[PDB]
Design a protein around this ligand. Structure first.
Ligand SMILES: NC(=O)c1ccc[n+]([C@@H]2O[C@H](COP(=O)([O-])OP(=O)(O)OC[C@H]3O[C@@H](n4cnc5c(N)ncnc54)[C@H](O)[C@@H]3O)[C@@H](O)[C@H]2O)c1
Ligand SMILES: NC(=O)c1ccc[n+]([C@@H]2O[C@H](COP(=O)([O-])OP(=O)(O)OC[C@H]3O[C@@H](n4cnc5c(N)ncnc54)[C@H](O)[C@@H]3O)[C@@H](O)[C@H]2O)c1
Ligand SMILES: NC(=O)c1ccc[n+]([C@@H]2O[C@H](COP(=O)([O-])OP(=O)(O)OC[C@H]3O[C@@H](n4cnc5c(N)ncnc54)[C@H](O)[C@@H]3O)[C@@H](O)[C@H]2O)c1
Ligand SMILES: NC(=O)c1ccc[n+]([C@@H]2O[C@H](COP(=O)([O-])OP(=O)(O)OC[C@H]3O[C@@H](n4cnc5c(N)ncnc54)[C@H](O)[C@@H]3O)[C@@H](O)[C@H]2O)c1
Lengths: 332, 332, 333, 333
């Protein structure tokens, strides 16, 4: 089995272990964070939005035993000092949020791993993959890659269909996004100087910037420079949606758009016709779930403006995309 | 001394009484609801989002005493039976949500009131007023008028400035809206058959339809048929924003758009440049609060798509617009 | 199979259908509510706190198809007129909240059903059962019984162990309880005149009365008149805990109380030693989950005051208790 | 002209400045935190639970101007490098949460400040004052004192009335408490190793320990060893209540208790008879607000168990008590 280490046992890291535990041929040999093993085990077993872990998890000296198999636990904030070489670690899932570019992420390779997947945008100099859209750009010679953002994994399959079947002149994106741990619990100073993320997460609609639309060219080259957008964090603990308002190169109807999305559906890109809300998306394994009920095509004097909306669980949808990308990568 | 009756002592009705108490030339002679006076007084004094009433409020038999002055209390679900003639009520604020067209609202005229203002869209059979945009369409001979919806009062001043300064080809609106009482507390059947308002209000992003953009022609005739949009209810108990993505007739910059909004700012239309969030808008008295920090102009190959955003407290912003429209109307 | 009808396809009614679907020998033949079948199907499939239904659910004409089996759907607010006799309904789960005494619940018997279980306190004149505590009082000749409240199913197994092993002089209960559908979404008039349930559910700590402790005598007769208590509704959509502060008849230690609770553990009464919070209880199938980490026995000059705490998902814990009582009841007749 | 410096411009620090701006004879000369002045001004002006600041607030060169008066701003995480001596700081309000004992708080003294008031429990070797209960223990010669915790300021006036009017044998406290910043936004590792504060603050009922009842002896010596309790954090951003279940030394009625609380009510200890909920308490200036509607006296064979409940805005109630203690203390230095 390919051996994986998870650096950062947070929301994405812990769910990544859940998904990898359900996979065969790949196993997690070690996890690293800033806390003792008892804290990590408790958070792995009990989850406020994703439910209890469906499996066995017990504590040992400096390890957790998951489904009968031992996983080493480390608490070292500097990746260069981790024993990845000693443990034969092939791929590191970098999920701390503090090593989100190539030079920082390479500390893992100096620690003895062969490859690193960043669970976030990683810059314009590393390949960036949304599984189901462009995973084929990988050939295994890359040392550091990126699985993009949760929002990019939601937007990209929707935008890819619009570009291929109708063509895109331009588009503005709005993601209505669950609050995350980078927002404060209550009004307090923020480490990055962000005056809006400084505010109480569960009390506010919080405008915030996102690069998912601007950087879309890394996933869909033909859309480079055609999209921008922003985000609104709102008080749901997980579950999000992405709206895209676009000008297309050809006329379209709501029925034509919806039919194209369904034709492109896959394990990564679901198609929905029910009148769902965000909680219905919690825990889904699609990276993106197009919502045909929200498609709108407005025609005013022959000029068309199109709205398309797709849901995503920013935690579990992205985690499943990250693990799919990891598995595809690990075979090269 | 124009005498007012409030039919429906809910969120809008109770806040309207707060505002009318601070107003000159208008006084509330009576309120009506489905509940005893003790319940109405308690809800007037204590408010979970708008704070405690800053004034005196005591109970008398079949009456409440507000700031030393008597207001009669009735509990009659049949408006046709209310004693508006014997009390001499000049204007009724119809705020129950159950009498939102001319034929139903005229029950107050048969009951002896002289005028009715509906605190919601009232159908195309009724003049619809956003104060600060089109109040001049009132000549005073109208019997029943409408103050539009909260979203309309937010959108109209923003769209009016864009139309005046640049011209609008078309636009799609997305309002990220506080949950309201027409949503269920927990998943349960919904009276109107709405599968999304059936869901727990405080747990979900809930897509829902709205006519604010569709009906904008009633307030700004030159924009008739050029705007559409929809809503997303999110878990804040009050406070909302409206995004408009539009194609304009002339080139624009972020600085030009913001300067025009600031020049037009007023008591009905505020202008903001701080990094605010939704809780900062709770209790504001603007009908709409333009947010210059969210203005975006995207240009791709000479083609432009424009994003503008305005905040509004769907409760208090609309209530102040309703009272402004009431005062203007009563002067004719 | 025993054929069951659910009157009131609400939180308890819909989750009861999920649990009965997993049970053998008992089947839900019909559900009734105030709404069209498409609305009921959608709410059965999608649930904001309990997750998507793990099964198949499709629509037919005045029926829903669940796991390949048809369930007729009705929309009649008056239970007298439901076709329970025509459908051979043995037991009706009365979950509307509007027929919570014996004479009202008997509308289902006049409609052709043989038996009724009320999913709430049903008054002092009907047998009231917490499964795992007093289900043995059912001999099958009863027509209308009650499965008590969610809080009673949480309190009763905990209080029973205290009574048997230490004896209870008196106790005051405080249940910290998730908000429910009887609270308004925002500040608004309340149908029952309750000034505190009138307030926005997800914004407030809301004091409210509860009869679970006062009525405990119906489940544990030896505790009749020895308990009272109250509730605090808080902004979690489901998941609750019950604290009991009691004076015992004999000295106790934290370890002795915890050992007694674990010894009494079962499928209805779980035992927990982890540092859990309310979200960890969402969806559990225990009727009550004792939390050994919160036990406190205080001694001041030989005088002892004891705190014991149990968790419960007021929706799913109670629903499973309701179905367990339904299954035991249907076995007797 | 008492000059105050606020170390830690958090929830308590920012509200403390709001209240001191309304106080005569005392003024804030400087504030210190870990962040640039622009962030601090923004958080002072805009507040998600306490509303916008009712006053003027603008930015200047490494300072904020509040109501026309400039307040220097510092960003030094080491307290004993601060220029308190150069600025003439008389009293430092220590509100960081990182210097909550005499040894750490004395960094402000070595930095040239005369006095320090810790906005939290400060250890058994620092005088602890709940204003309105025991401020008379201060004689002005102390260098480091404590204003206790928010829960202590809520419990103490209530327990003092019960002790004076009836006498207390023992009592167990349960505080239903707003979530605070020491809880994580979402499930994540927690710096102090607390498995329950590690969990999502706004999604959970979270059991947690508190020392308010055990340490009550520092404020009311006659109750030393007589009280204990714990806390339950719930998803309200501010606003809390404290329940006390106590055994009293003489018989009592709810009417007697409520009358005694009402007679003792003051600016520090309010009395309420309306059916309020937690949002009604946000921003109040009482340190504790007794709720007579929740008083319960249970009698079982002559044995009595008493429940009394008091509200408090854990932020603003405590801040007002802190400023009251500061004014009394400063009048003696
Ligand atoms: N949460 C989402 O919806 C989401 C979606 C897609 C991507 N991401 C990305 O995943 C990453 C993690 O986000 P998250 O939401 O899981 O955040 P989180 O804070 O829940 O997880 C971060 C974890 O890393 C640990 N950590 C921090 N510094 C460390 C260090 N030097 N060494 C070891 N461990 C360290 C922390 O203790 C924490 O457990 C970020 O890059 C984020 O942008 C998050
Ligand atoms: N809340 C908002 O954000 C908002 C904004 C703009 C407009 N509105 C509109 O204002 C109206 C009221 O909405 P709300 O949010 O105040 O709703 P609400 O439910 O808070 O208030 C409605 C009130 O009317 C009473 N009522 C119902 N039927 C009645 C009858 N037959 N006779 C007398 N009283 C009766 C109810 O008891 C309740 O107090 C609706 O038309 C709504 O669309 C609401
Ligand atoms: N939810 C809990 O935590 C909980 C726990 C234990 C017991 N209960 C009890 O269960 C019962 C239902 O509570 P719930 O939480 O499911 O409430 P709910 O409002 O979710 O469900 C009630 C359902 O009954 C329907 N209904 C109402 N009147 C009707 C009528 N005349 N005919 C047919 N259908 C009708 C409603 O449409 C609704 O779907 C109540 O007695 C409640 O006290 C609830
Ligand atoms: N919030 C309440 O309900 C409450 C009530 C009573 C007492 N308290 C106590 O008050 C204190 C502050 O709590 P809070 O709720 O305001 O927390 P907070 O985190 O909101 O405030 C702490 C502030 O101190 C700053 N800070 C941290 N370390 C610092 C350092 N070394 N130097 C300078 N500034 C530093 C932080 O940036 C932050 O602005 C704690 O001791 C807490 O227990 C809180």
């Amino acid at each position: 089995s390919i051996k994986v280490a998870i650096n950062g046992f947070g929301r994405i890291g812990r769910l990544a272990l859940r998904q990898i535990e359900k996979a065969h041929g790949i196993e997690v040999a070690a996890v690293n964070d800033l806390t003792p093993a008892e804290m990590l085990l408790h958070l792995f077993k009990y989850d406020s939005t994703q439910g209890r872990f469906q499996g066995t998890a017990e504590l040992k000296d400096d390890a957790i035993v998951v489904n009968g198999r031992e996983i080493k636990v480390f608490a070292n904030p500097n990746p260069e000092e981790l024993p990845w070489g000693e443990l034969g670690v092939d791929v590191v899932l970098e999920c701390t949020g503090f090593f989100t570019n190539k030079t920082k992420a390479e500390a893992h390779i100096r620690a003895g791993a062969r490859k690193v997947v960043i669970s976030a945008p990683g810059g314009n100099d590393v390949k960036t993959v949304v599984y189901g859209v462009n995973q084929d750009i990988l050939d295994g010679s890359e040392t550091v890659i990126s699985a993009a953002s949760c929002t990019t994994n939601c937007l990209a399959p929707m935008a890819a269909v619009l570009q291929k079947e109708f063509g895109v002149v331009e588009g503005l994106m709005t993601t209505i996004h669950a609050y995350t741990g980078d927002q404060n619990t209550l009004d307090a100073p923020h480490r990055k100087g962000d005056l809006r993320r400084a505010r109480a997460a569960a009390l506010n609609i919080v405008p915030n910037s996102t690069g998912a639309a601007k950087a879309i060219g890394l996933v869909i080259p033909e859309l480079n420079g055609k999209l921008d957008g922003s985000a609104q964090r709102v008080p749901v603990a997980t579950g999000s949606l992405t709206e895209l308002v676009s000008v297309l190169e050809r006329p379209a109807t709501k029925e034509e758009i919806n039919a194209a999305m369904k034709a492109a559906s896959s394990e990564s890109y679901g198609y929905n016709e029910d009148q769902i809300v965000s909680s219905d998306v919690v825990g889904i394994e699609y990276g993106s779930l197009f919502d045909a009920t929200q498609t709108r095509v407005m025609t005013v004097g022959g000029k068309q403006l199109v709205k398309t909306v797709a849901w995503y669980d920013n935690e579990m949808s992205y985690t499943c995309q990250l693990v799919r990308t990891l598995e595809y990568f690990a075979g090269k």
